[PDB]
Ligand binder design. Structure first.
Ligand SMILES: Nc1nc2c(ncn2[C@@H]2O[C@H](COP(=O)(O)OP(=O)(O)OP(=O)(O)O)[C@@H](O)[C@H]2O)c(=O)[nH]1
Ligand SMILES: Nc1ncnc2c1ncn2[C@@H]1O[C@H](COP(=O)(O)OP(=O)(O)CP(=O)(O)O)[C@@H](O)[C@H]1O
Ligand SMILES: Nc1nc2c(ncn2[C@@H]2O[C@H](COP(=O)(O)OP(=O)(O)O)[C@@H](O)[C@H]2O)c(=O)[nH]1
Ligand SMILES: [Ca+2]
Ligand SMILES: [Ca+2]
Ligand SMILES: [Cl-]
Ligand SMILES: [Mg+2]
Ligand SMILES: [Mg+2]
Ligand SMILES: [Mg+2]
Lengths: 61, 319, 435, 423
């Protein structure tokens, strides 16, 4: 059980006691965000298309 | 209303426990994967200890001690005894054993130079036949066992021990001797050397019903034949061995200040030589009980291990 | 001297950041107006406390911090709070509507329209740094902003600051104070996307902080104020080496060198003692507080290190502590506890001591103590927290419960099984090292 | 932040008026729109439901709609009638004759655009609109037919905002006309598609509560609305006062709606009142979960809870609240689905409702709600297999096919609930 690398200063001290020895680029991120954005816009376009079909059914009634 | 789950359908012991718990009217069984339980009768392998004690408002208890496998796996037991100062290499109640892989052989060969050994894992006078057979353990075969008469036959003692959430060690007062019906032969036939109930049932049942001799009869025998008692000649050594093993691992498996609690039933198998010295052979972490002792023991499990934590509205010796 | 920038994301990150900078000011003698009488180098300096504080010509010590939340109510408390004078309007960023506890809403929908602003405001702080070390990022796992926007921010920070280190202080979800059923989803989605970008992450389970407040501070029903002031102490103990003179963990790179030998397993377990009630005391010794570092009841994450293996252990003392008493306590503890290291690591402890004892907020719940310690140990037992989280994920995702909320924000369902598969490999990585 | 309230038809306007009477009292707003409260908690989140006019006067962000003036004339001269913005009264003169087709396709189509003009003027004045709140019945013509038409038009113009309804379900025990099952079936199909959150208010449950529990020999619509008002104030507490849980409509939906179509909630309230002995936290918890306190005539034990939101109001022990909420969960855990962990969330508010020192409000997404749609489906089929009373609808241009499709989709909704009740 040896003590190692003892350093002392006015505000404290530190040491080590050994007991026993032994990324995606900016463009790729922008594509992910834009890909998800286009999926949101496609889902909304399908909603508004579906609501537009109800509008013409309402006029037909 | 306390709640519990069952996750080992093949356990005879706790199948009776749950039946008793239901018969009280204050316990309700949930399904296997319902996490809002007070008591877990868990699986024998890969029990998810990490998911216990994280349910607000529920005191959670499980019937297994995490880490107790160190004592209940044969190879681990040898390592535990020879590396723990509490038990130490010079342990007088455990046979000389060595862990070897298909490790420790150079040390087995040295001691090799009576010399009959046994190899096992979870009998030959020549080591060559043992190694060619071979994770296993080789320990000295006890060549001078205590032989019951009439019969001149081998046996081993089974003791049931219950450790509760407070780490109180309870020895069931009723043990059992798994006897052999074939006379012991000092010179491959295993039926007279191995006392296992399954091996014996495959002369079986002559001296005792099912080759199970219980303490009352065995005690009367030691008095009539050897002018001593089961308490003095054997049971003191058993209690000493049980304590040494469990207190050694207590700091590693205790749940005293844990977010969940553990208890566990253990099966200690012992071996007695002709000098009435007791030897530890194995510790079973998931043992079964004798048919005529299931009611008493399982009720004791509910009283000591479960009701103490979850009270409602002695058969044990406290070590 | 090398600067560190703190980034606080979401309600949890912001409110915890508030309690930290309040504590920092008390520890350094900085007043709520930003003045530091003890600092004689007016308008500048490269002292150790300058790692977290810049200085104006008027003598105001300004945190190197940026607060970001997608709704304004939490950050508005900073603009009007006690330390409003410290912070600069550019440092406080607020949106209009929040991520609604939806990782996909914070990461994709709302994160895409505010990410550039946050980076620009961070750039304004970085430009004031002569030698930026890296970033400290505070956030929750379960919130939509703390989870979704953080993962996006960490991605861009690795792009804009490739050579800089990044450390996390993360709030692991606990039902006793959780606000959303889908927090297991968000926790695993942000861990997957952030794993390769974080060098060292300190997880704090609200469950553990909650019980420590109930059992040791005798608070019947802890609030976020109770939890955050305790968290502030642990965070302070971890960052003290960067803010005071010393020779241990003096830069963000050292945390990785000392606590993280394997990059993926970068979640050290924090254990703190003593936690004493202000309403109460016999002062605990070096041996008693060091022994308390091995009690699960004092860990920031409830788990059993006895059934795992250590890769590194750091002891950070504050108060009346001398090396002699530390080694006498360690020796005693090795003989009474199960402390198994991986065979390829030295069985040892890196010890740092700061003579200044812990500072406590006036009127707080914590009693002043003459000595305290925070242990940082990288143990595989912390994987118990991943197992719990992955199990809850599996239960809901097997039925696709709530999944439509994430797909509706533009996220593909494949990202769920992609993140879960990464967590599965992570759990087995721990298992290989732990056995 | 801001919510835009809409109330349509007789029922919708009568319950909506009472709703504004109750929360106006809780927030300290007098019939003149002036604040006269004693706490800042009343004004901290007042802009969610109120616009601040000149002179620091608060005007509900409410739009009153009907195809006949009768019911709205009474509202204007009611107690709090003067608080509503006069321009937000949008009414025709012909009525809908309890005819979904008249509200949805003919009479209502002539009026819907002027309603949307008012909605647009309110929304445009919102710093950050979060969604809409509609009060209506499903058994009539205007609230059912024109109400669902408005929802469809609103979703087309604000597709990224949350749509929330308080929908009164018809019952033969409290019936005006025999065609209520037709109007209700046609409306549920609309709600399944175009709302995020629907509080199912069953007049069968309201009547049973007034009769059995409150011992009211002959309940009136006023007595029923007393229960509705109390329920509406309770389920909107988290939206109106400072809090951490379900503080806005979108977060509520995320916590409550695991599958988009299964968004029909079973509300409950405790204590049930029409008494000076304040309850105990244990008593609030038991009653709050008691079927006799549910506003939808469905037995929770016949199904399973997907999600639950609990709101406690008054000065009480939060410690005791959490203990009791964990108590009921841990004792009847079989009625909560195990594949959504921690699906019960609890909020507490210090300000209690008027007349009580403590109260509890229940919001459950239970699969047992299928009993409500089953009841409507049987009443619908009993008439539809003989095409009885259909001429009232074909005379407005509807074809029988539209009825068959409405029936089919509601039977599908029933089976979808049964799917997850056995999971
Ligand atoms: N310890 C602590 N935990 C908090 C605090 N605030 C929130 N949390 C936890 O954080 C989780 C919720 O995340 P939040 O940070 O509130 O959500 P957010 O980051 O603002 O994201 P959104 O609100 O959905 O946009 C829950 O598990 C809370 O228990 C806090 O002040 N202290
Ligand atoms: N060192 C030894 N000396 C003498 N006999 C021994 C022995 N080791 C084992 N035996 C005998 O051989 C038998 C082998 O059984 P063993 O000890 O391996 O437990 P086991 O796991 O195989 C059955 P159980 O789990 O039900 O106890 C023992 O019952 C014993 O009679
Ligand atoms: N709870 C309640 N239900 C009502 C009230 N008025 C009508 N109803 C119910 O609503 C249905 C009739 O719809 P109604 O609102 O009167 O017709 P509308 O004006 O065309 O929407 C029937 O099922 C009634 O039981 C009311 O004041 N309170
Ligand atoms: Ca200076
Ligand atoms: Ca006309
Ligand atoms: Cl860089
Ligand atoms: Mg065995
Ligand atoms: Mg938030
Ligand atoms: Mg009417």
């Amino acid at each position: 059980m040896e003590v190692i690398e003892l350093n002392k200063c006015t505000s404290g001290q530190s040491f080590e006691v050994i007991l026993k020895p032994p990324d995606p680029s900016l463009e790729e991120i922008q594509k992910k965000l834009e890909a998800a954005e286009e999926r949101r816009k496609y889902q909304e376009a399908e909603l508004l298309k579906h609501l537009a079909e109800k509008r013409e059914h309402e006029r037909e009634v | 209303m306390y709640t519990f789950v069952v996750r080992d359908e093949n356990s005879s012991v706790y199948a009776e426990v749950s039946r008793l718990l239901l018969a009280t009217g204050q316990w309700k069984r949930l399904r296997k994967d319902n996490p809002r339980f007070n008591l877990m009768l868990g699986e024998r392998n890969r029990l998810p200890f990490g998911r216990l004690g994280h349910e607000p408002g529920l005191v959670q208890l499980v019937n297994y001690y995490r880490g107790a496998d160190k004592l209940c796996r044969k190879a681990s037991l040898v390592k535990l005894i020879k590396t723990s100062p509490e038990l130490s290499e010079s342990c007088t109640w455990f046979p000389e054993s060595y862990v070897i892989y298909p490790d420790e052989r150079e040390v087995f060969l040295a001691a090799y130079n009576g010399n009959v050994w046994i190899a096992k894992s979870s009998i030959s006078s020549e080591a060559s036949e043992l190694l060619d057979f071979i994770v296993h353990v080789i320990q000295k075969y006890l060549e001078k066992p205590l032989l019951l008469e009439p019969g001149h036959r081998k046996f081993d003692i089974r003791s049931w021990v219950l450790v509760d959430h407070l780490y109180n060690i309870y020895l069931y007062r009723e043990g059992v001797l798994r006897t052999s019906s074939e006379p012991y032969n000092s010179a491959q036939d295993k039926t007279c050397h191995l006392t296992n109930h399954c091996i014996q049932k495959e002369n079986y049942g002559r001296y005792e019903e099912g080759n199970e001799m219980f303490f009352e009869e065995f005690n009367q025998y030691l008095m009539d034949a050897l002018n001593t008692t089961l308490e003095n000649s054997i049971l003191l050594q058993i209690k000493h061995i049980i304590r040494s093993c469990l207190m050694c691992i207590e700091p590693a498996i205790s749940t005293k200040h844990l977010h969940y609690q553990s208890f566990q039933l253990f099966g200690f198998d012992f071996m007695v030589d002709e000098e009435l010295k007791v030897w530890l052979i194995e510790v079973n972490g998931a043992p079964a009980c004798a048919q005529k002792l299931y009611a008493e023991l399982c009720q004791g499990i509910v009283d000591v291990a479960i009701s103490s934590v979850f009270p409602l509205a002695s058969i044990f010796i406290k070590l | 001297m090398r600067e560190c920038i703190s980034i606080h994301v979401g309600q949890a990150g912001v409110q915890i950041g508030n309690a930290c900078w309040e504590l920092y000011c008390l520890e350094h003698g900085i007043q709520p107006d930003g003045q530091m009488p003890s600092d004689k180098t007016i308008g500048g300096g490269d002292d150790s406390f300058n790692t977290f504080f810049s200085e104006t010509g008027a003598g105001k010590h300004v945190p190197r911090a940026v607060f970001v939340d997608l709704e304004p109510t939490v950050i508005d408390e900073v603009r009007t709070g006690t330390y409003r004078q410290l912070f600069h309007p550019e440092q406080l960023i607020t949106g209009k509507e929040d991520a609604a506890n939806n990782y996909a809403r914070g990461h994709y929908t709302i994160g895409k329209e505010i990410i550039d602003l946050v980076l620009d405001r961070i750039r304004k702080l970085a430009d004031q740094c002569t030698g930026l070390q890296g970033f400290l990022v505070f956030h929750s796992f379960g919130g939509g902003t703390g989870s979704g926007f953080t993962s996006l921010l960490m991605e861009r920070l690795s792009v804009d600051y490739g050579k800089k280190s990044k450390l996390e202080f993360s709030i692991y979800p606990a039902p006793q104070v959780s606000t959303a059923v889908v927090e297991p989803y968000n926790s695993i989605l942000t861990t997957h996307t952030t794993l390769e970008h974080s060098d060292c992450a300190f997880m704090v389970d609200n469950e553990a902080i909650y019980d420590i407040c109930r059992r040791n501070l005798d608070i019947e029903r802890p609030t976020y104020t109770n939890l955050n002031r305790l968290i502030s102490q642990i965070v302070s103990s971890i960052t003290a080496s960067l803010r005071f003179d010393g020779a241990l963990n003096v830069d963000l790179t050292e945390f990785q060198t000392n606590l993280v030998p394997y990059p993926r397993i970068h979640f050290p377990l924090a254990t703190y003692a003593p936690v004493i009630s202000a309403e109460k005391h016999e002062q605990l010794s070096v041996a008693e507080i060091t022994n308390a570092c091995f009690e699960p009841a004092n860990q920031m994450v409830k788990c059993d290190p006895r059934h795992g293996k250590y890769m590194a252990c750091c002891l950070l003392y504050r108060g009346d502590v001398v090396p002699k008493d530390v080694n006498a306590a360690i020796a005693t503890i090795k003989t009474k506890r199960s402390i198994q290291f991986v065979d390829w690591c030295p069985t040892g402890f890196k010890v740092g001591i700061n003579y200044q004892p812990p500072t406590v907020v006036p009127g707080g719940d914590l009693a002043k103590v003459q000595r305290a310690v925070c242990m940082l140990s990288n143990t595989t037992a912390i994987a118990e927290a991943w197992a719990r989280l992955d199990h809850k994920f599996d239960l809901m995702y097997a039925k696709r419960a709530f999944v439509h909320w994430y797909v509706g924000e533009g996220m593909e369902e494949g990202e769920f099984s992609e993140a879960r598969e990464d967590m599965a490999a992570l759990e087995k990585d721990y298992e290989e090292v732990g056995v | 932040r801001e919510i835009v309230h809409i109330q349509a038809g007789q029922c919708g306007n009568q319950i909506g008026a009472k709703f504004w009477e109750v929360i106006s009292d809780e927030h300290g707003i007098d019939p003149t729109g002036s604040y006269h409260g004693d706490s800042d908690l009343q004004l901290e989140r007042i802009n969610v439901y109120y616009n601040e006019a000149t002179g620091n006067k608060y005007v509900p962000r409410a739009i009153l709609v009907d195809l006949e003036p009768g019911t709205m004339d009474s509202v204007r001269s009611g107690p709090f009638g003067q608080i509503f913005r006069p321009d937000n009264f949008v009414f025709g003169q012909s009525g809908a004759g309890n005819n979904w087709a008249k509200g949805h396709y003919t009479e209502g189509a002539e009026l819907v655009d002027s309603v949307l003009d008012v909605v647009r003027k309110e929304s445009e004045s919102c710093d950050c609109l979060q969604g809409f709140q509609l009060t209506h019945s499903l058994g009539g013509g205007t609230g059912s037919g024109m109400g669902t038409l408005l929802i469809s038009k609103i979703r087309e113009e604000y597709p990224d905002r949350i749509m929330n309804t308080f929908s009164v379900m018809p019952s033969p025990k409290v019936s005006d006309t025999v065609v209520e099952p037709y109007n209700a079936t046609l409306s549920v199909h609309q709600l399944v598609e175009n709302t995020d959150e629907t509080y199912c208010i069953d007049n069968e449950a309201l009547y049973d509560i007034c009769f059995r529990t409150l011992k009211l020999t002959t309940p009136t619509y006023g007595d029923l609305n007393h229960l509705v008002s109390a329920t509406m104030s309770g389920v909107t507490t988290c939206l109106r006062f400072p809090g951490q849980l379900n503080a806005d409509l979108r977060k509520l939906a995320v916590n409550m709606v695991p599958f988009p179509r299964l968004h029909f909630f079973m509300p409950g309230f405790a204590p049930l009142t029409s008494q000076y002995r304040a309850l105990t936290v244990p008593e609030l918890t038991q009653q709050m979960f008691d079927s006799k306190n549910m506003m939808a005539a469905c037995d929770p034990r016949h199904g399973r809870y997907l999600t639950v939101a609990a709101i406690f109001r008054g000065r009480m022990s939060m410690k005791e609240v959490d203990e009791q909420m964990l108590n009921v969960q841990n004792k009847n855990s079989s009625y909560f689905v195990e594949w959504i962990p921690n699906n019960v969330k609890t909020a507490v508010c210090d300000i209690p409702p008027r007349g009580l020192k403590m109260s509890a409000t229940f919001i459950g997404n239970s699969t047992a709600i299928q009993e409500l749609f089953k009841r409507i489906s049987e009443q619908f089929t009993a008439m539809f297999r003989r095409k009885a009373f259909l001429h009232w609808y074909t005379g407005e241009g509807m074809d029988e096919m539209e009825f068959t499709e409405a029936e089919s989709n509601m039977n599908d909704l029933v089976s979808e609930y049964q799917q997850y009740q056995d999971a």
